[PDB]
Amino acid sequence: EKVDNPFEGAKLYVNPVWSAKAAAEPGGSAVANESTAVWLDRIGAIEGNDSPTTGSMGLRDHLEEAVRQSGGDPLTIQVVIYNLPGRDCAALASNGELGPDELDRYKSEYIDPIADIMWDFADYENLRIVAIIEIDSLPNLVTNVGGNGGTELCAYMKQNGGYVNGVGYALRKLGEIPNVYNYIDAAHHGWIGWDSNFGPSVDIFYEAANASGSTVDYVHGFISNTANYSATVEPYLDVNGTVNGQLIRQSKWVDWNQYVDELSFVQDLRQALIAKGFRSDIGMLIDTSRNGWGGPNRPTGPSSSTDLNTYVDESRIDRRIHPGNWCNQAGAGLGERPTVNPAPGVDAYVWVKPPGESDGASEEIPNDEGKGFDRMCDPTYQGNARNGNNPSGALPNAPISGHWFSAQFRELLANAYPPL
Ligand SMILES: OC[C@H]1O[C@@H](O[C@H]2[C@H](O)[C@@H](O)[C@H](O[C@H]3[C@H](O)[C@@H](O)[C@H](O[C@H]4[C@H](O)[C@@H](O)[C@H](O[C@H]5[C@H](O)[C@@H](O)[C@H](O[C@H]6[C@H](O)[C@@H](O)[C@H](O)O[C@@H]6CO)O[C@@H]5CO)O[C@@H]4CO)O[C@@H]3CO)O[C@@H]2CO)[C@H](O)[C@@H](O)[C@@H]1O
Ligand SMILES: [Ca+2]
Ligand SMILES: [Ca+2]
């Protein structure tokens, strides 16, 4: 009885807090009326906490605003559920208020108040809430537990079941509300595109969707590339091709990944999830907030080089040093503006990460948000095993994640693709 695609035939929520930050930058008004997801990055964000990350508006404030913006017609707001115990277990920049042993608090003091507020808007027949479920959680239990590269925190979150159970709890509590549409976070191709990562991620997604009373029927779909930078389509790169006595997969960039872009990845992931037992009508989202890679450095066509790494590096639109470079990526532009059913199996390209909000601080900054200094956000960081021991490629002088980052917004705007 819920629509096949919550984005189809609907106005899109404009977040007034984000809108005002965007319009305040030079040329910012050009994107100020784009739709961006509202993040519930802590318990305080539910009622409203007057914070750097979420301003003065609580959830009810946003949902009342969304109803106002709607004109009684279908309107879709995206709400990010992002507060698991031991949140961000393989990193530090977005560790949260709830520790690894605090599932009970997540349930009763985070999910339960959110579900209560959303139940109050269930009598608004034309309000559609897209709930985006726990970014950067379940794939950590596949890729960051094995010890050789992993973390003890992620290993613990696997053994105590906090991620799996927290997600399943959110899926049922929110999924049983008549106008709520759950999309599970599905990393991106640069994380789980590999043979050793792909199937085991499908497995854990399925595990989580059957935890805490949930079934696959509470899952409307999946989102990739949330708060990341991976190309939607790599027009001049074919992951299975050659140059010229060597495989594209042998390049430093591809590095034996099965995918070079998000689209081919979500399309394959969609088929595998269905075969695993997810509903056949599931739709994928791709977060295109920051994956445009436009401006004067965007390749105009395939390279003429017959050197493997040179062909790849000159042909690729994702201009990062390594696909594991996730923080405040230098040279990134705004991607495709939110669009309905842009491709087979894709419900929408969406702006979930709000452009201009930081991925993390480039130095130690004292905070009350539970966030530590993550060296992947330090421009001078020479890296580790997860990123091929490469420079971070992070932008200098970045503030705490979620805080406004003027330099990043300006660059993103300048490098928008397609051009504004
Ligand atoms: O403004 C709104 C709110 O923002 C919140 O902050 C966000 C923030 O914006 C965001 O940046 C962040 O999310 C990131 C995570 O913190 C981070 O840990 C994560 O890193 C991933 C990375 O995406 C991925 O590329 C990497 O892939 C690894 C993989 O694990 C590994 O298995 C694979 O191994 C293969 C080798 O590469 C290969 O050599 C060998 O042959 O095969 C191996 C396979 O067997 O290698 C790849 C490397 O490419 O994994 C890491 C994790 O380990 O990325 C996230 C972004 O995608 O945090 C927040 C949420 O996203 C604020 O907190 C909030 O206040 C605001 O409201
Ligand atoms: Ca659908
Ligand atoms: Ca190096």
Q: How far apart are the CA of 382 and the centre of ligand 3, in A?
A: 6
Asked whether the bond before 418 is cis by omega within 30 degrees of 0, the reply is yes
* Residues near 192 by beta carbon (within 8 Å), at least 6 away in sequence: 139, 142, 143, 186, 198, 201
Ligand 1 pocket residue status of 139, Cβ below 6 Å: no
- Token pair for residue 267? 């399309």
Ligand 1 pocket residue status of 355, Cβ below 6 Å: no
Q: How far apart are the CA of 383 and the centre of ligand 3, in A?
A: 7
Q: Whose CA is nearest to atom 48 of ligand 1?
A: 324
* Residues near 113 by beta carbon (within 8 Å), at least 6 away in sequence: 43, 46
* Residues near 297 by beta carbon (within 8 Å), at least 6 away in sequence: 319, 331
Pairing of strands 180-185, 127-133: parallel
227: left (phi over 0), alpha (psi -120 to 50) or beta: left
Domains defined for the chain, CATH in brackets: 1-420 (3.20.20.40)
Distance CA 227, CA 359 (A): 8
Distance CA 290, CA 298 (A): 14
Per-chain residues with Cβ under 5 A from ion ligand 2? 4, 281, 283
If 0-12 CB within 10 Å is exposed, 13-18 middle and 19+ buried, where does residue 243 land?
buried
Catalytic residue numbers, as ranges: 88, 136, 359
Helix (H) or strand (E) holding 197: helix 195-209
Distance CA 346, CA 225 (A): 13
Determine whether the annotation assigns residue 50 to a binding site.
no
Atom of ligand 1 nearest to the CA of 144: 53
Distance CA 103, CA 126 (A): 33
Query: Mutate which of 386, 387, 404, 412 to test ligand 1's pocket (most atoms within 8 Å of Cβ)?
Result: 386
Q: Whose CA is nearest to atom 9 of ligand 1?
A: 359
Q: What is the CA radius of gyration of the chain?
A: 20
* Closest by CA position to 229, among listed 350, 352, 329: 329
Q: Are 95 and 87 in contact (CB under 8 A)?
A: yes
Amino acid of residue 183: Y
Ligand 1 pocket residue status of 290, Cβ below 6 Å: no
* Closest by CA position to 330, among listed 342, 338, 322, 341: 322
**Resolution of the experimental structure, in angstroms:** 2.2
Across 235-353, where does the E strand assignment appear?
283-287, 339-343, 346-350
Determine whether the annotation assigns residue 351 to a binding site.
no
Q: How far apart are the CA of 181 and the centre of ligand 1, in A?
A: 24
Ligand 1 pocket residue status of 291, Cβ below 6 Å: no
Q: How far apart are the CA of 198 and the centre of ligand 1, in A?
A: 15
With b for 16 or more beta-carbon neighbours within 10 A and e for fewer, the 190-212 pattern comes to bbbbbeebbeebbebbbbbbbbb
The length of the chain in residues reads: 420
Helix axes 152-160, 162-175, angle to 10 degrees: 60
Amino acid of residue 231: A
Q: Which ligand is nearest to the CA of 282?
A: 2
Determine whether the annotation assigns residue 194 to a binding site.
no
Residues β-bridged to residue 181: 130
Query: Mutate which of 80, 194, 390 to test ligand 1's pocket (most atoms within 8 Å of Cβ)?
Result: 194
Query: Mutate which of 89, 136, 228, 321 to test ligand 1's pocket (most atoms within 8 Å of Cβ)?
Result: 136
Helix (H) or strand (E) holding 183: strand 180-185
Determine whether the annotation assigns residue 326 to a binding site.
yes
Q: How far apart are the CA of 333 and the centre of ligand 2, in A?
A: 29
